[PDB]
Amino acid sequence: HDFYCSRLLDLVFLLDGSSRLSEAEFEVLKAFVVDMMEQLRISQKWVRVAVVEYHDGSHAYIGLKDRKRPSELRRIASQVKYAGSQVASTSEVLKYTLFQIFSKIDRPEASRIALLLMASQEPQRMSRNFVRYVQGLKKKKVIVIPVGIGPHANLKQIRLIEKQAPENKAFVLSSVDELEQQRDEIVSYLCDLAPEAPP
Amino acid sequence: HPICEVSKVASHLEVNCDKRQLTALPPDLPKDTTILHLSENLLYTFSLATLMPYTRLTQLNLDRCELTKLQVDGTLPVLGTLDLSHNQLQSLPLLGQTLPALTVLDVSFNRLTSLPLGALRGLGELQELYLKGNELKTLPPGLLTPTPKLEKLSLANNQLTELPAGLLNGLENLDTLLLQENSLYTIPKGFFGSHLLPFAFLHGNPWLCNCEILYFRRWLQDNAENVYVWKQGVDVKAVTSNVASVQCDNSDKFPVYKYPGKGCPTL
Secondary structure, three states, X not given: OOOOXXXXXXXXXXXXXXXXOOHHHHHHHHHHHHHHHHXXXXXXXXXXXXXXXXXXXXXXXXXXXXXXXXXXXXXXXXXXXXXXXXXXXXXXXXXXHHHHHOOOOOOOOOEEEEEEEOOOOOOHHHOXXXXXXXXXXXXXXXXXXXXXXXXXXXXXXXXXXXXXXXXXXOEEEOOHXXXXXXXXXXXXXXXXXXXEOOO | OOOOEEEEEOOEEXXXXXXXXXXXXXXXXXXXXXXXXOOOOOOOEEEHHHHOOOOOOOEEEOOOOOOOEEEOOXXXXXXXXXXXXXXXXXXXXXXXXXXXXXXXXXXXXXXXXXXXXXXXXXXXXXXXXXXXXXXXXXXXXXXXXXXXXXXXXXXXXXXXXXXXXXXXXXXXXXXXXXXXXXXXXXXXXXXXXXXXOOEEEOOOOOOOOOOOOHHHHHHHHXXXXXXXXXXXXXXXXXXXXXXXXXXXXXXXXXXXXXXXXXXXXXX
16 A cells, blocks of 8 residues: 556566465465556556466466456456366466467567566476576566565575576565565556556 | 547546347547447447447447448557457458557457458557457468567457468567467467467367377467466356367367377477
């Protein structure tokens, strides 16, 4: 509820759906999202959004073009079923986002951000093309804000990100319990990234 | 304006005439109108020519309108996006001449039984073509030739039994091929060629595991990472990596990539 802005934004949520987060802890991540959403004019007109929980392949719950009232979204976002799988390919969800989310460029004047909630580390066999994706994304003016969480956050990937571009600022949290803490600060940095929006 | 909504979204002038029972295009709409939504109405038919007055028209939606016929006259200088999904069109109209700037074409979920030769002639700028959910059984030869900039193709959910061997020729920017849920059994020799294709869905097919599925076998082997499964769950959609989904018709859900090819020719 603190500070809260509204802008031309295409915000993508990528939630780690690995076991490195208890079901109980998944909820605290989901909460984090629902808040992030509230602090933003939800509509395919100002701020579009998408929620994807990953591990083996992506699980799209919301899409930028999905037309549903804000109330409706926030709900769905919160009803995202816990996965708890053992693996969560970060390389995969980014390969996915690069080609299945930001393939074409509809709203060219808006900013794009791929909030990447990492809580684990993907099996190295899957990172072969990681960088490609981050590059191909940046090439599409997509900004990636990795948000490490807990002792198993893949820092090298959060670091490789930070340095692919300036806006790729990272954020680390000892746990899910620390999101409600950083929430505001984060959604801030976002505000300062995208162009103002008229009511 | 009286019937539809208006609203300057950034530098786009969006107009909504969606879900309000309309039977045909309203009158005097904004002269800057870049985007037009006509979804969920009742038209059964339409005629792109009546849109010429809208010289700024960058995007059009005629989905869920019962369209069974689409007149294609005059010309729409800048239309890049055309949604005709969820309609009852018996036959794919020839957009080429009239929609020179089209980059996205969606006729998924219609009644299409076939695509006339040169069906795509004139649509060079085309990048996304979706024909999922139809009744196509086979394809025209140079179907995709008119479009070498294509990035995604969806032919999933149709009754296709075989693809044109050189269907992907010229496409060096294709990044997604969707063919799951069809009647295919084999893959033409060198059908994939040598591009990368990060996303290909081939599950849901009676793959005939005989000596002629071998090109397709190796191919899969070198592309395990590129084969995904599509699952919809009325609230979630999932693209999951699994080369194993491409299974042998009768062979007890036997992974086609593991098919021994025992007794098959040497070369």
